[PDB]
Design a protein around this nucleic acid. Sequence first.
RNA 1: GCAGGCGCGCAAAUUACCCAAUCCUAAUUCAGGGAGGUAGUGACAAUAAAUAACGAUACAGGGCCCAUUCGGGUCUUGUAAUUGGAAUGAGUACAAUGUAAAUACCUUAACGAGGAACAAUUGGAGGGCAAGUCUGGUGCCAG
Lengths: 250, 126, 19, 171, 106, 74, 123, 118
Amino acid sequence: LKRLAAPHHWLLDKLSGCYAPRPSAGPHKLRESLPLIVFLRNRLKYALNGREVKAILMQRHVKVDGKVRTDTTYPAGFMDVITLDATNENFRLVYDVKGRFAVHRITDEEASYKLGKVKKVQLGKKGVPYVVTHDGRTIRYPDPNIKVNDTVKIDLASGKITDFIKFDAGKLVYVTGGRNLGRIGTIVHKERHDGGFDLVHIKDSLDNTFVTRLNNVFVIGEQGKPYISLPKGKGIKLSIAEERDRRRAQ
Amino acid sequence: QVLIDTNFINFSIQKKVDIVRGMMDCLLAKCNPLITDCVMAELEKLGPKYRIALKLARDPRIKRLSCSHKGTYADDCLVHRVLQHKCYIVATNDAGLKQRIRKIPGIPLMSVGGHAYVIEKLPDVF
Amino acid sequence: TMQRSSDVNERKLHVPMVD
Amino acid sequence: YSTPKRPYESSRLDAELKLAGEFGLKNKKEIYRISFQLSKIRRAARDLLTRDEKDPKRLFEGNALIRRLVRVGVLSEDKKKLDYVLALKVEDFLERRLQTQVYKLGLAKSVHHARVLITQRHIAVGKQIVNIPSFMVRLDSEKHIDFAPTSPFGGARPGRVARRNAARKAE
Amino acid sequence: KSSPFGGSSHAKGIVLEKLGIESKQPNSAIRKCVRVQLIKNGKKVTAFVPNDGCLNFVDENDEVLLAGFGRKGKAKGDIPGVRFKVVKVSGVSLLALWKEKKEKPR
Amino acid sequence: GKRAINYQILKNKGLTPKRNKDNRNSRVKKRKKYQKAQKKLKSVRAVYSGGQSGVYEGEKTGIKKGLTRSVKFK
Amino acid sequence: AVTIRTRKVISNPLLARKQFVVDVLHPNRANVSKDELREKLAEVYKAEKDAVSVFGFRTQFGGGKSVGFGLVYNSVAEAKKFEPTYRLVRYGLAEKVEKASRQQRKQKKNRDKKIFGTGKRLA
Amino acid sequence: CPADDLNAMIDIAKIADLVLLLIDGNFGFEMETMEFLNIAQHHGMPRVLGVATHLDLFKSQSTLRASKKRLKHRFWTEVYQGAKLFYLSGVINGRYPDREILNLSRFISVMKFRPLKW
RNA sequence: GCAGGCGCGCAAAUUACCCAAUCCUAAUUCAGGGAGGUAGUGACAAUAAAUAACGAUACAGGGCCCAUUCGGGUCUUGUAAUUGGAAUGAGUACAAUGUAAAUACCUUAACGAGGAACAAUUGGAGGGCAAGUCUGGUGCCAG
Ligand SMILES: [Zn+2]
């Protein structure tokens, strides 16, 4: 019923009163999802305080990924889009260099799909197959070539799938968690243990490999074709010293 | 510029405190340890039980003066070439030499104790 | 402690009188 | 603030007397404050000397430290090495404070008159009126010190005594 | 064990009678003394009040406060034995009474 | 007919020694005893003053023969 | 003579509201008189003193420049909609007043909780 | 107590057990209550409660609280330290604010008196 | 639980304001919230400053200071409230900002200094004085 031990990627100061917004129940976990209040108040500063955040939610105005959802503490977290008709905007909200949630600015034809790593797949009832992805989109009737740890392209206007994406060597991956948070690239080798501690290993320009547990990472896409425009010019975060060295060079 | 003497070097070795890094950590400034050749006379005359003190006195950081007085009474040479100038900081551990120094007005003197040098009469020690 | 108590218990000391 | 180890030496007493006297100070606590920040600045400067040359920790943080001290002005730019930070001392720190700096700049004719006309809100560094002595003017803002715009020593209205005596001379 | 009386720094004491009223020499160490009943032990000791001119504030059974003395030398008229000075009388500091800031209530 | 209280009964700082306007300001006494310590060691050593002020008309205070104030080397 | 400038003018059609940080420079005046400066701000903007609203002021040390936050927008009817009651009381376009501070209305509703019945009473 | 006579003031100080003491904060203290305080101090201190009336100083509430802290400090140095005093406002329709009056009556309800030898 | 108090005959925040913020709860923009925020008290700690600055004149030189042994050095020493204008903030207060409203800070009209009486305290070290008192005893001394 309280807070202020908030996840520190929310850009939350300490002298903003005591409590933080407790994320209500929704699609995502609390530790990797930001609410609409911490979005619209102190992430892009379109509002000032919770009263007018309630005003711009119950103005029928916000539409998190296709629908209004008038709730201040609504945990719209990773890979969602937040469209607003006024201000022309669509925000796919993703991870970044340092770990916090980078906003995008996305046009409509890229804003009319999201994608999702499958969390589990089963057979639901009456013979019907059964797919649930990371946001609780329990979706019936996939294509039958279903793997787990696998990316499906959600149409997001009507809630079906429009495209399927497998996973193997030589196709992109993006990490959500660990020390290496918000980082792309997939080209070393595809090692697997049993009992976890396995990763699709990660490329670099200097062949730097980051290996974590496989629950965090999931596919964006392939070489030349990722399905999301990427933040800050394909952020791999080489070095601050290499950044200053490139500053001295060019 | 830190004048050195014999019991200071012996006590520094038996407390295992280094000379130059010990002075830098005691005083937080560059210290130039200075040995009079008349006190190196006493540190030679102590005999073969102090060869460690001898070959640690022979050190190119520790630049050495040259005396001009008959005999090798290092305490009187120290108090004389201090009260001629009042620019040196005396490192010692002798009680009587300490009493001579803290009788004469306003030079600083240091002495090893515990496991670091301590400095007595200097204002800007912190 | 005993330090904050053995000095403050002398507030209970007075001259014995009757009321 | 920080108290000394053995504070009641006659040498330290004559030290505090001389520094407070010729720099116009109000007690020994000012000396102790800037002596504490001097002590922490060269205690952070000596361990970088004890570690290896061209350790990038030493290189970057030493260039950081001397870039700060050149900009404050206690370290002249001819001595851009880290052992000169060890060679630094506390009268260079209280030379750069605003009271002594305005007395060196003129316009004050004594150190305590410098302190008191700072405290009368008469002196602004460029744009901002400053009413504290211990300010540490940086080397760029050394030549920005003149009287405030809203001060009778600047170009404002004459002060209280001036217009009161002008009215009584009108009587 | 941590003090001259139990462990406390001060103890309320009931004044029995003024020692040395009839000493002829003013400001004499017999004159500036007074009998006092320790309460937390309940026994009679003798104690100083400095400045026999301000002896005359405390008279009789006025619940005085009894602190240590601490001889920092060898004074001539100073008798040994006593190590208790009086620091307050009936609640108010008799030093403040001597420099006549406060007032003694009764 | 309204009485009041006067200054001693208001402030209650009765029966003090004679204090000092010098000691009232904790900077000024350090200004006004550094001024003495300047003029004290005009007597201890002979501190520099500013050099030849006027034209040289003598040191104005005497010169003695049988006295050398120069430190010797043992 | 004062000069009022604005900065970081960001629009916000989520409230149809144009928000900014305003800074006034008054070289010799004490302060800039919130009503007077907001009507001059409405003059330098399109219109409607009643629909411009500036609220976050502070005068910096040494005098001369004050900085605060300022809201302008159209349409005074949704100015009545989208602005809080204390600011609409501060300007002369709304007024709300109660009487019973905390304890009086608290004991009032506690008494009604005690009563539980409507207006019947006999003797 | 009729305030023009030590002839009364002395014996009221002799008999009384509680004294509530009526300063006016607009004027500070007065020598009448100082005289009564010393008479009570020497004949044996009854339990004293300060009350400071006439708080119509100005709109300057800073002056109001500065005079109040000077009054409570001069009161604490002169009856026992930290003694209780109540700040009454102006009279409203014949009598004082009933809030402070009810609090004062509460304290004198729980006063718990003490013996004196006379 | 919050406020205030009591249990000793010897003691210490206010029975203040408000949902305006941060959130929470609910039929739910709104209502409620002694959660929480504000104010007052608070020598409990921490940070920064004031309690004056600049002159002019007249005199005293048997004058000052540093020296454990009759040594050294200096008006460039002290007193005269002799005396003069400048500058200010404690305080005061039109106002305005501040905040839910108010107080506080910052800003500011007009006021506001000479003993700047708009009156700094706590200690410590020493003398000296009487037609005075008391005690000792080889006068006139000693304590
Ligand atoms: Zn030699």
